[PDB]
Amino acid sequence: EAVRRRFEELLREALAFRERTGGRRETLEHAVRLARELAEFAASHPEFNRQEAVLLAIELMVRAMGVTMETHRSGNEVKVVIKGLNIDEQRALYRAVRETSKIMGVETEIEVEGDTVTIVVRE
């Protein structure tokens, strides 16, 4: 609950930032910062589901940047498809998902094709 409540607080900050942001570069920097805060906070609450924490960090960045996403469940795996990203947003999202996965001890696979980044979170 504490981790889910933290996501909600960071989501409101993410939506207020993009409202007053000066560009996609500033929004991206703030989005990576928010995702790291959530990841480190969730790591301090080991009782919370590690797989779900990674997904919440991804969704926090998706909402902060205002990009389109899709989620599909395959048993224990979760696939996230994020479209419309520029080159800088792809590199930062790849970087942030890798770091967040390592913090949570979760195995994730990342594929980049065109504007589309596909993330698979397992177990």
Residue numbers in the entry: 2 to 124
Show me the paper's own sentences about this structure.
To allosterically couple binding of the effector to dissociation of the target, we designed structured fusions of the hinge switch and binder such that when the switch is in state X, the target can bind, but when in the effector-bound state Y, it will clash strongly. To measure facilitated dissociation kinetics, we used surface plasmon resonance (SPR): with the target affixed to the SPR surface, we incubated with the host, then measured target–host dissociation under flow of various concentrations of effector.
We set out to design protein systems that undergo facilitated dissociation. We use a switchable target binder (host) and a flexible effector that can rapidly bind to and switch the target–host complex to induce a large steric clash with the target, forming a strained excited ternary complex. We show here that by explicitly considering excited intermediate states when designing coupled protein systems, a broad range of facilitated dissociation systems can be designed.
